[PDB]
């Protein structure tokens, strides 16, 4: 008799990816710096989210790369904002009876969905597609989250008369006072 | 009849790279193909031949429709699959990733005995912990009962409660409460109240200060 | 086969592991050919002596200033040339025979008996010393009789004239010479000789002529090679090749198009001649396609005539082609690099693993350079190292190395404006004696040691650091946030204990705030948790002057900020991690001062030193109960601060030390001193006296400026005063007797911060990168490891600067207050940091044990990647701290307390009395 | 060209009159009553109009055999399923029943800490407790470890069967002394999976 015992309930603040399906294709909720929200086909460092609950049932989704907060507007489309508000940038999480998580703004009555069908939420009716989310633990190594952007390209002093190509001479930035 | 290479019959229904369903659902692994003529499809799991011998509970046989049905998917079913059907002139295959997840539509269950009936000497460092378990995001709050006016009960039989530690955006270690140099007033019933979208559950413990030992 | 070497960039795309490539220190294989090069126009001189003919160079320089009539006077000086070879330790002498000298009047004429007499005397001298010769038949000096009559190499009738001249060379100088080079640098002879006009024949005809001439060079070389093979090789057993110069090129954006474009450039400059000689006999397909018409075609008989006409691969990788004479169009819009290890691998893969003989290498220095050429020595050192890496790590079959230009001489089109010689020649002098340079002494020792043998000064030392050693980490900018996360809610709520488990706030009754302890700060505990995992004994952090006192004066104080610092210091002591606190830190937008104080001069006004004394007094009163190690200045910028600023900074430190010594040390048994950035300064040439003097002078301006008043004589360093006084720069303030006594002994320990070492050269190679203030030419040893920020990994510098501080300032307790390196990438460079940490700590261990240095602390630089980016031992990604590989290895050093051997253990030390810590007073 | 009074396609293959599908198990109901010309087919439940918007998950109406599918069936779908197909003249009515049994989307979890540490002697016997949260009564076992080579933390499987009762549940370790030690478990399991919990259970 093999023993595994995988503990249930470890997602109390860890990195999660929101997964939704529609019988056509899968998509992971993703937040970009420019506020664009779309669906990543696989797990991306951009799609890594950290849901945090403030009240007994209300959660806020941030994302650790864009440094933004998943907010919402009157039409029902979602976006990311660098500033937090408790009015519309906060959604009441609700686990459906089939095991799927749906997020909707408490005062906007519109479910958070990866599609463009922003419909109202009622207890027990066919929700819009791309809305039945499913939290997935982040299996992406966190080494990739570091920004590799410090890339340098040298154009000055690049000609056909270079005298020190291997850069033996490296002067140091020293100030010289002058009376 | 030309001997054309096998190809996907319906490429527009193959974009679901990853399958994720709650434990207990049935996944659909469908991949119509072609050939000279259409050959048999033998699914194999991560290399090992996958059929109805390694998992009892129902595996529907659909070969004329070229699909695989996985009824009552259980935690022990994660792993990329393959639509490996071999033709004489062509060899096509598309991976079908499945990641079943285990849900918990329940109120946050706290570890029994945490916090415990721990007593500390006056001037010592006591620490109260409440291990909470809930897949949905819980809100952890630490409460202390007060005797503000008369007894500890309020207007309509509600015990007075003052919040010590909360779970905000930038507040971690919420499930641990630190009480160093406990005075006489640092004694009473500490309840760790945890709740999520399903419900709220609290675990209460009593801390008593001993002036002598 | 062509195209095999296109994978070269793939192998070298991944950075090598900085463990085997770090302390590489290999030894060249036995039988290696250590050679030194020379020419017949660069050095020989005597352009009309003893009936000598007229080269195309003798007419190019005169063009009927900067001519090679008598360049090095080597024609008349045979004894001084071979004496240099004897004292150089070299085993091969690569020189060339002047075509117009041996055969002035005509190839089918009377050989010049005196011209032949010079070369037989030279070879007789080479035989006596044991130096084997490597004769180059043609080194760009074609007779003028063959340029104005047959038109030069553009004619195919010069193959017979070259063959008749080669037979004269083979017949005469055949019993002693076993290595022949037919034509040296056929690319420069062809492309710049006829297609550009920048070289000996002034033509500038067209690229058609350059490809026609190079067509004749291969035919002329193959005509000579088959002359040796069928007539002289059976009775002589020598070897013949062609010196194929090349460059190295790098992709622009690292794409498959760029890699093919890079291989297209190499085939255009190197496969142009190597493939017709080494592979099949025809040009590469890359250059046969685009310029199919302007490039001449090869007959089938000719193609098999040139196949295999080279007994070894002769490579000329120096300043001739690299960056100077390479056609820009031949680069195909790519990046040119002077990489020799990658080029040697490219030759090995592409040309079926040939026996490579590097017949010309090295770099050049400016023309106004005497026996001190430190830039050229380190280029030679890197280039020699690159072949050793190619031999050992790449499997390349390199059989010899030739350091070019045994002596200074006429450097072709550049004239005398550059010098490539290992031996200095005074061109203006009438004697022209060979004076060994810095590279001559370096090359001689490398040949004697046969490469880079391991040194005892770099062998790791197995030993244990003393007890109560200060194994610590630093965090200059701790993250401060007075966020009260515990007991911060004061209201009284109701509780639906049975109904709904919700809170109903009662309006009207609230409680009073509990005593705020140190667990109410949400960020202090996570930081201590990481430090507990590192097993560090000490933690070093600096206070923010602009935060404790925002307006500078003591009228207003930020008590909440002080409470965070006091709580951070109190929690660290609770977990047995001694805090080390720095009062002031220069790294800030306002020089670490409050905005009000930073407006006037920010260090110029003496009131700043006074205002720091009161600020230091406030810090000792609040934080001092828990902090027992104080740092007054935290590595001040000795290179970026003015003399007046450094004058008040010394006074400010003295006031803070005299505040602590008189008022607080009795109540709180702590210590206080100054932290100085002690980066080692090493002379570029190890045997140059003027470089040692320059190294000491720079050290005075860097370390001794702010250490001599405190740790030494109480006044500014003598060398610093001499340098400024003789410069008529009297900007260094003088120390009065009251000030001198004030700062004379304001130290409890020597806290130094070491990061890297810098090579200093007295001579100025170029004035642009020359520090005219200090008359120093800062350089670096390119063979050293480098961080992505170009910081040299020099472990032995820490041991050297520790001994210098002990020698200059006595036997003081020395703290390594900060010593770490950065990693630009995520995990590809952290294996460097563990190498950096392991060796630097080991060299600090060497200084402690071998030199008896009173070292009582090592502080790894940076606590995490968030506070100090790129330097931390903890990776900060997605608002999460993850330990790096350097952290785990650092913890193993801390737990073992140094580097214990296989079987050795020190017992527990209770109340050990090394004089660096707080005893019973 | 006669009138339209047709039958279905497969008589025995269509009607089953009973479907005890577990929760989350996909099932579909078919009413292929063909004919000429093709009639219209309407599906309704509990005497009310049935669409694809009033049910969770979602249903799909096929036209190859004129059937609706139910991916991820739910307990809320209980009731009656009447399909009504009417031709130009006349009508055909069929009935279907559905009682989906409850199947939780998780293996039966239990409150942590339990079972508590066993530390008692004769006179006050150990009362080991383990409460499991589930809809129905799950499978709960204890699985006392057989003491061979200190088998408490190893590999290659440790099958040590020990059955007292399966069905909040409590156990009465009568006459607790220094003869039964080791680590104890609460093997709570169901169809989805099996779970157990343990702590620093050390007894004299
Ligand atoms: O408006 C709005 O709102 C909005 O607006 C705005 O906002 C927007 O805009 S924007 O721009 O902004 O964007 C818009 O957009 C919108 O919108 C939104 O929202 C929406 C919604 O709305 S709401 O309302 O909802 O809210 C959404 O939307 C969605 O989507 C859309 C889209 O998509 O577009 C839509 O839709 C529509 O359209 C579409 C289209 O698409 S596209 O692409 O085009 O575009 C679609 O479609 C169409 O149509 C259809 C129809 O028909 O209808 C089609 O299709 C579909 O379906 C189909 C079916 O077919 S049929 O024929 O039927 O029809 C599919 O399929 C296929 O096929 C099939 C068959 O074959 O049949 C298969 O099959 C399966 O199943 C069957 C049956 O079963 S049962 O049960 O029934 O019977 C089967 O079978 C089985 O098996 C067998 C065998 O085995 O053989 C059997 O058995 C037998 O035998 C046995 C033996 O024994 S043993 O032993 O062997 O076993 C015996 O026993 C027995 O008894 C016997 N039986 S019998 O029967 O025979 O008697 C058995 O039994 C059986 O059974 S079972 O159970 O088992 O099963 C088979 O097998 C199966 N399979 S498996 O394997 O899996 O199972 C399948 O299905 C398939 O296959 S294949 O291969 O082919 O593939 C298809 O697929 C579908 N589609 S897909 O897509 O998917 O493709 C057609 O086709 C189409 O067309 S096309 O062109 O495309 O092609 C859809 O559908 C429509 N709809 S409907 O209603 O109509 O449906 C819409 O809208 C929606 O959707 S829905 O659906 O929901 O509706 C959107 O998205 C939104 N947007 S956002 O933006 O927001 O995002
Ligand atoms: Cu459940
Ligand atoms: Zn030098």
Domains in chain B, number: 2
| CB B11 within 8 Å of CB B54 | no
As a whole number of angstroms, the distance between CA C921 and CA C901 comes to: 35
Element (H, E) at C120: helix C113-129
| CB C68 within 8 Å of CB C61 | yes
Q: Which of C11, C33, C13, C34 is nearest to C393 (CA)?
A: C11
Separation of CA C230 and ligand 3 centre (Å)? 51
Give the CA angle between residues B196, B201, B207 to the nearest 5°. Answer: 130
Is D70 part of any domain? yes
- The alpha helices in C623-762, defined as continuous H runs, are 643-659, 689-699, 705-711, 718-726, 737-742
Give the CA angle between residues A35, A38, A43 to the nearest 5°. Answer: 110
Sign of the four-CA dihedral C159, C165, C167, C173: negative
CB-based contact, A141 to chain C, within 8 Å: no
Place of tokens 């919700």: C502
- In the structure encoding, which two tokens stand for residue B43, read together? 């699914």
CB-based contact, B74 to chain D, within 8 Å: yes
| CB B144 within 8 Å of CB C503 | no
- B41 phi/psi in degrees, rounded to 5: -110, 125
As a whole number of angstroms, the distance between CA C95 and CA C39 comes to: 5
As a whole number of angstroms, the distance between CA C237 and CA C233 comes to: 5
Tell me, yes or no, whether B40 and B91 share the same domain. yes
Residue ending a domain, among D102, D133, D152, is D102
List strand residue ranges (DSSP E) for C725-830, in order.
750-753, 757-761, 777-779, 785-786, 792-793, 814-819
Report the DSSP beta bridge partners of residue A71.
A79
Q: How many alpha carbons lie under 13 Å from residue A44 in its C-beta half-sphere?
A: 15
Residue of C nearest to A64 (CA): C878
Within 10 angstroms of residue B42's Cβ, the number of other Cβ atoms is 13
How far is Cα of residue D42 from the mean position of the Cα atoms in its chain?
30
Q: Report the greatest alpha carbon distance in chain B.
A: 99
| CB D83 within 8 Å of CB D42 | yes
Q: Which of C536, C632, C650 is nearest to C592 (CA)?
A: C632
Given the DSSP bridges, would you call strands C398-403 and B132-133 parallel, antiparallel or unpaired?
unpaired
Within 10 angstroms of residue D137's Cβ, the number of other Cβ atoms is 12
As a whole number of angstroms, the distance between CA B180 and CA B176 comes to: 13
| CB C135 within 8 Å of CB C177 | yes
Q: Which of C401, C394, C220 is nearest to C315 (CA)?
A: C401
Protein residue whose Cα sits closest to atom 30 of ligand 1 = A129
The class of domain C464-899 in CATH terms is: alpha beta
As a whole number of angstroms, the distance between CA C42 and CA B19 comes to: 75
Tell me, yes or no, whether D1 and D92 share the same domain. yes
State the method. cryo-EM
Chain C hits for B161, Cβ within 8 Å: 492-495, 503
Is residue B63 lining ligand 1, measured as CB closer than 6 Å?
no
Q: What is the residue range of D194's domain?
A: 103-199
List strand residue ranges (DSSP E) for C404-470, in order.
418-419, 423-424, 435-436, 463-464
Within 10 angstroms of residue C111's Cβ, the number of other Cβ atoms is 16
Atom of ligand 1 nearest to the CA of A119: 26
Within 10 angstroms of residue C659's Cβ, the number of other Cβ atoms is 22
> DSSP of D36-94, one letter per residue?
SS--EEEEEETTEE--SSSSSS-EEE-SSS-EEEESS--GGG-EEEEEEEE-SS-EEEE
Element (H, E) at C443: helix C438-449
Q: Which of C605, C764, C642 is nearest to A175 (CA)?
A: C642
Chain B hits for D58, Cβ within 8 Å: none
**Cα distance from B90 to chain C (closest Cα, Å)?**
29
Within 10 angstroms of residue D61's Cβ, the number of other Cβ atoms is 12
How far is Cα of residue C156 from the mean position of the Cα atoms in its chain?
48
Separation of CA A35 and ligand 2 centre (Å)? 36
| CB C238 within 8 Å of CB C133 | no
As a whole number of angstroms, the distance between CA B195 and CA B205 comes to: 18
List strand residue ranges (DSSP E) for C80-176, in order.
92-96, 132-138
Chain B hits for D111, Cβ within 8 Å: 109-112
| CB C627 within 8 Å of CB C667 | no
- In the structure encoding, which two tokens stand for residue C612, read together? 């720091």
Protein residue whose Cα sits closest to atom 138 of ligand 1 = B13
Please count the helices (runs of H) and the strands (runs of E) in chain B. Answer: 0, 20
**Cα distance from C811 to chain A (closest Cα, Å)?**
31
Place of tokens 């038109």: C151
- C797 phi/psi in degrees, rounded to 5: -65, -35
Place of tokens 């009515």: D93
As a whole number of angstroms, the distance between CA C845 and CA C465 comes to: 7
CB pair distance less than 8 Å for A168 and C375: yes
Q: Which of C784, C711, C790 is nearest to C746 (CA)?
A: C711
**Ligand approaching nearest to the C-alpha of B23:** 2
| CB B204 within 8 Å of CB B191 | yes
Protein residue whose Cα sits closest to atom 98 of ligand 1 = B61
As a whole number of angstroms, the distance between CA B54 and CA B42 comes to: 15
Q: Which of C127, C117, C122, C47 is nearest to C78 (CA)?
A: C122
Q: Strand, helix or coil at A54?
A: strand
Separation of CA D103 and ligand 2 centre (Å)? 9
As a whole number of angstroms, the distance between CA C652 and CA C606 comes to: 9
- C425 phi/psi in degrees, rounded to 5: -120, 125
- C525 phi/psi in degrees, rounded to 5: -60, -45
- In the structure encoding, which two tokens stand for residue B80, read together? 């990329």
Is residue B32 lining ligand 1, measured as CB closer than 6 Å?
yes
How far is Cα of residue C312 from the mean position of the Cα atoms in its chain?
32
Residue ending a domain, among B48, B71, B102, is B102
Within 10 angstroms of residue A139's Cβ, the number of other Cβ atoms is 9
Element (H, E) at C361: strand C356-361
Is residue D12 lining ligand 1, measured as CB closer than 6 Å?
no
Give the residue from D50, D51, D57 with the most A CB atoms within 10 Å of its CB, the best one to mutate: D57
CA dihedral in degrees (B16, B19, B24, B30; nearest 10)?
50
Residue ending a domain, among D81, D102, D123, is D102
CB pair distance less than 8 Å for A146 and C642: no
Give the residue from C479, C483, C486 with the most B CB atoms within 10 Å of its CB, the best one to mutate: C486
As a whole number of angstroms, the distance between CA C844 and CA C818 comes to: 13
Q: Which of C303, C286, C304 is nearest to C295 (CA)?
A: C286
Place of tokens 């000996």: C200
As a whole number of angstroms, the distance between CA C254 and CA A99 comes to: 47
Give the CA angle between residues C287, C293, C294 to the nearest 5°. Answer: 75
- In the structure encoding, which two tokens stand for residue C624, read together? 């001092």
Q: Which of D144, D133, D151 is nearest to D188 (CA)?
A: D133
Residue of D nearest to B134 (CA): D109
Chain B hits for C485, Cβ within 8 Å: 165-166, 168, 171
DSSP state of A49: B
Query: Of B19, B109, B135, which is closest to A11 when you measure between CB atoms?
Result: B135
| CB C197 within 8 Å of CB C203 | yes
CB pair distance less than 8 Å for B24 and D109: no
CB-based contact, D189 to chain A, within 8 Å: no
- In the structure encoding, which two tokens stand for residue C225, read together? 């090679």
- In the structure encoding, which two tokens stand for residue A49, read together? 């989210």
- In the structure encoding, which two tokens stand for residue D88, read together? 């130009």
**Ligand approaching nearest to the C-alpha of B104:** 2
Q: How many alpha carbons lie under 13 Å from residue D144 in its C-beta half-sphere?
A: 11
| CB C682 within 8 Å of CB C695 | yes
CB pair distance less than 8 Å for B178 and C486: yes
Given the DSSP bridges, would you call strands C792-793 and C132-138 parallel, antiparallel or unpaired?
unpaired
Question: What residues sit around ligand 3, an ion, with C-beta below 5 angstroms?
Answer: C 372, 374, 684-685, 688, 691, 761
Cα separations in angstroms, A135 against A103, A123, A126, B74, D197: 12, 21, 20, 17, 25
**Cα distance from C570 to chain B (closest Cα, Å)?**
13
- In the structure encoding, which two tokens stand for residue C198, read together? 């920048």
As a whole number of angstroms, the distance between CA B203 and CA B113 comes to: 8
Within 10 angstroms of residue B183's Cβ, the number of other Cβ atoms is 12
Is D204 part of any domain? no
**Cα distance from C643 to chain A (closest Cα, Å)?**
8
Is D128 part of any domain? yes
Q: B152-159: list long-range contacts, CB under 8 Å, 24+ apart.
A: B154/C494, B154/C495, B154/C506, B155/C494, B158/C494, B158/C495, B158/C496, B158/C497, B158/C504, B159/C494, B159/C495, B159/C497
As a whole number of angstroms, the distance between CA C862 and CA D87 comes to: 83
As a whole number of angstroms, the distance between CA C326 and CA C321 comes to: 5
Report the DSSP beta bridge partners of residue B191.
B143, B204
Specify the resolution in Å: 3.0
Is residue B147 lining ligand 1, measured as CB closer than 6 Å?
no
Separation of CA B75 and ligand 2 centre (Å)? 15
Spatial CB neighbours of C752, under 8 Å, sequence gap ≥ 6: C675, C676, C677, C678, C801, C802, C805, C814, C815, C816, C817
Q: Which of C80, C900, C114, C756 is nearest to C466 (CA)?
A: C900
End-to-end CA distance of chain A: 87
As a whole number of angstroms, the distance between CA C294 and CA C297 comes to: 9
As a whole number of angstroms, the distance between CA A36 and CA A32 comes to: 5
| CB C758 within 8 Å of CB A172 | yes
How far is Cα of residue D162 from the mean position of the Cα atoms in its chain?
26
Interface contacts B/C by beta carbons within 8 Å: 74
Give the residue from C251, C364, C877, C884 with the most A CB atoms within 10 Å of its CB, the best one to mutate: C877
- In the structure encoding, which two tokens stand for residue C872, read together? 């931390």
**Cα distance from D116 to chain A (closest Cα, Å)?**
17
CB-based contact, B177 to chain C, within 8 Å: yes
Cα separations in angstroms, C655 against C742, C745, D40, D49, D107: 8, 12, 100, 91, 70
Is residue A115 lining ligand 1, measured as CB closer than 6 Å?
yes
Within 10 angstroms of residue D138's Cβ, the number of other Cβ atoms is 22
As a whole number of angstroms, the distance between CA A21 and CA A136 comes to: 13
């Amino acid at each position: 008799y093999p023993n595994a015992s995988p503990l249930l309930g470890s997602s109390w603040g860890g990195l999660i990816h929101l997964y939704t399906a529609t019988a056509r294709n899968s998509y992971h909720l993703q937040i970009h710096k420019n506020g664009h929200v779309d669906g990543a086909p696989h797990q991306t460092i951009y799609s890594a989210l950290m849901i945090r609950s403030e009240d007994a049932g209300f959660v806020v989704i941030t994302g650790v790369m864009s440094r933004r907060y998943l907010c919402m507007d009157f039409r029902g489309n979602i976006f990311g904002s660098h500033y937090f508000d408790p009015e519309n940038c906060r959604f009441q999480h609700q686990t459906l009876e089939n095991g799927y998580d749906v997020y909707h703004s408490p005062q906007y009555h519109f479910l958070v969905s990866l599609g463009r069908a922003k419909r109202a939420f009622l207890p027990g009716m066919n929700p819009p597609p791309y809305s039945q989310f499913l939290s997935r633990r982040n299996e992406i190594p966190l080494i990739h989250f570091n920004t590799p952007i410090p890339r340098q390209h040298t154009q000055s002093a690049e000609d056909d008369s270079e005298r020190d190509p291997l850069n033996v001479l490296k002067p140091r930035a020293r100030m010289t006072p002058a009376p | 009849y030309p001997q054309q290479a096998p190809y996907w019959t319906h490429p527009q229904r193959m974009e679901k790279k990853l399958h994720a369903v709650p434990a207990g659902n049935t996944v659909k692994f469908r991949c119509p193909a072609a050939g000279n003529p259409t050959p048999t499809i033998r699914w194999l799991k991560d290399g090992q031949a996958f059929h109805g011998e390694n998992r009892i509970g129902g595996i529907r046989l659909r070969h004329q429709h070229w699909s695989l049905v996985m009824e009552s998917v259980v935690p022990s079913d994660r792993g990329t699959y393959t639509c490996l059907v071999e033709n004489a002139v062509g060899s096509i295959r598309y991976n079908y990733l499945l990641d079943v997840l285990e849900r918990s539509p329940h109120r946050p269950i706290l570890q029994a005995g945490l916090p415990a009936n721990t007593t500390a000497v006056v001037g010592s460092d006591v620490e109260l912990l409440c291990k909470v378990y809930s897949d949905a995001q819980p809100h952890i709050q630490w409460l202390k009962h007060i005797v503000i006016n008369g007894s500890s009960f309020g207007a309509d039989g509600f015990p007075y409660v003052q919040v010590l530690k909360t779970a905000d955006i930038n507040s971690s270690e919420v499930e641990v409460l630190y009480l160093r140099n406990v005075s006489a007033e640092d004694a009473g019933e500490y309840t760790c109240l945890a709740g999520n979208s399903i419900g709220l559950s609290y675990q209460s413990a009593w801390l008593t200060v001993l002036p002598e030992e | 086969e062509p195209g095999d070497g296109a994978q070269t960039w793939a192998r070298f795309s991944r950075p090598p592991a900085p463990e085997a490539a770090g302390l590489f220190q290999g030894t060249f294989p036995d039988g290696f050919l250590w050679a030194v090069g020379s020419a017949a126009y660069q050095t020989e001189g005597g352009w009309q002596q003893h009936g000598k003919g007229a080269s195309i160079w003798d007419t190019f320089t005169h063009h009927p200033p900067a001519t090679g009539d008598v360049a090095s006077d080597s024609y008349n000086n045979v004894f001084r040339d071979t004496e240099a070879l004897r004292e150089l330790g070299v085993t091969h002498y690569r020189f060339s025979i002047s075509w117009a000298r041996v055969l002035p009047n005509g190839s089918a004429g009377v050989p010049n008996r005196e011209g032949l007499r010079y070369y037989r005397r030279l070879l007789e001298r080479l035989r006596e010393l044991g130096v084997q010769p490597v004769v180059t038949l043609y080194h760009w000096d074609l007779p003028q009789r063959l340029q104005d009559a047959y038109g030069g190499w553009a004619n195919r009738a010069l193959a017979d004239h070259f063959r008749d001249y080669a037979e004269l060379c083979f017949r005469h100088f055949g019993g002693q010479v076993k290595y022949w080079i037919t034509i040296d640098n056929p690319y420069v002879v062809a492309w710049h000789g006829y297609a550009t006009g920048r070289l000996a024949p002034g033509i500038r005809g067209s690229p058609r002529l350059g490809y026609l001439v190079a067509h004749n060079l291969l035919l002329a070389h193959a005509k000579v090679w088959h002359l040796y093979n069928t007539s002289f090789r059976p009775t002589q057993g020598g070897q013949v090749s062609i010196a194929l110069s090349s460059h190295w090129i790098n992709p622009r954006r690292m794409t498959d198009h760029s890699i093919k474009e890079c291989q297209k450039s190499l085939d255009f400059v190197l496969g142009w001649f190597a493939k017709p000689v080494f592979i099949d006999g025809d040009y590469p397909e890359s250059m046969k396609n685009n310029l199919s018409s302007i490039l001449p075609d090869f007959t089938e008989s000719e193609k098999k005539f040139i196949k295999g006409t080279a007994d070894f691969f002769a490579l000329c990788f120096g300043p001739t082609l690299s960056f100077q004479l390479l056609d820009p169009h031949m680069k195909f819009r790519q990046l040119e690099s002077p990489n020799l290890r990658q080029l040697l691998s490219w030759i090995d893969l592409e040309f079926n693993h040939p026996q490579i003989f590097i017949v010309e290498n090295g770099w050049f220095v400016s023309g106004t350079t005497k026996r001190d050429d430190a830039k050229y020595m380190y280029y030679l050192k890197k280039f020699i190292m690159e072949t050793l890496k190619a031999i050992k790590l790449d499997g390349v079959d390199v059989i010899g190395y030739t350091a070019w230009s045994l002596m200074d001489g006429f450097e072709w089109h550049r004239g005398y404006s550059i010098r490539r010689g290992l031996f200095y020649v005074d061109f203006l002098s009438q004697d022209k004696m060979l004076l060994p340079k810095s590279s001559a002494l370096f090359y001689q020792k490398l040949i004697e040691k046969n490469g880079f043998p391991p040194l005892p000064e770099n062998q790791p030392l197995e030993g244990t650091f003393p007890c109560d050693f200060a194994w610590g980490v630093v965090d200059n900018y701790i993250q401060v946030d007075t966020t009260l996360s515990q007991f911060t809610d004061l209201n009284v709520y109701l509780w639906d204990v049975h109904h709904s488990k919700r809170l109903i706030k009662v309006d009207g009754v609230v409680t009073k705030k509990r005593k705020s302890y140190c667990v109410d700060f949400a960020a202090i505990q996570p930081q201590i948790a990481l430090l507990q995992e590192m097993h560090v004994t000490h933690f070093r952090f600096s206070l923010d002057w602009a935060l404790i006192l925002p307006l500078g004066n003591q009228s207003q104080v930020n008590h909440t900020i002080l409470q965070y610092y006091r709580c951070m210091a109190s929690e660290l002591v609770r977990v047995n991690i001694t805090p080390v606190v720095a009062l002031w830190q220069p790294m800030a937008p306002n020089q670490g001062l409050p905005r009000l104080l930073a407006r006037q001069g920010a260090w110029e006004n003496p009131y700043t030193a006074l205002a720091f004394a009161e600020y230091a007094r406030l810090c000792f009163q609040e934080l001092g109960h828990h902090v027992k190690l104080w740092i007054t200045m935290n590595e001040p910028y000795t290179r970026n601060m003015t003399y007046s600023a450094g004058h008040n900074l010394l006074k400010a430190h003295a006031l803070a030390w005299h505040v602590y010594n008189e008022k607080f040390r009795h109540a709180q048994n702590g210590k206080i001193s100054i932290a100085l950035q002690a980066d080692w300064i090493e002379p570029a040439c190890p045997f140059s006296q003027k470089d040692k003097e320059v190294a000491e002078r720079v050290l005075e301006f860097d370390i001794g400026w702010l250490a001599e008043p405190i740790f030494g004589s109480g006044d500014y360093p003598w060398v610093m005063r001499d340098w400024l006084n003789q410069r008529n720069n009297f900007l260094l303030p003088y120390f009065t007797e009251d000030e001198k006594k004030l700062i004379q002994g304001t130290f409890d320990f020597l806290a130094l911060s070491h990061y890297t070492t810098i090579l200093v050269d007295s001579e100025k190679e170029d004035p642009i990168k020359y520090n005219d203030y200090l008359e120093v030419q800062e350089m670096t040893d390119i063979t050293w490891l480098n961080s992505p920020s170009q910081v040299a990994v020099v472990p032995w510098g820490l041991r050297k600067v520790l001994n210098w501080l002990k020698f200059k300032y006595g036997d003081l307790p020395m703290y390594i207050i900060s010593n770490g390196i950065d990693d630009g990438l995520h995990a590809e460079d952290d294996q460097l940091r563990v190498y950096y940490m392991q060796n630097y700590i080991n060299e600090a261990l060497k200084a402690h044990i071998l030199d008896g240095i009173n070292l009582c602390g090592y502080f790894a630089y940076s606590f995490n990647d968030r506070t100090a980016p790129r330097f931390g031992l903890y990776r900060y990604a997605a608002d999460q701290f993850e330990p790096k590989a350097s952290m785990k290895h650092y913890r193993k050093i801390i737990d073992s307390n140094g580097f214990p051997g296989p079987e050795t253990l020190e017992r527990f030390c209770p109340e050990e009395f090394t004089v660096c810590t707080e005893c019973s007073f």
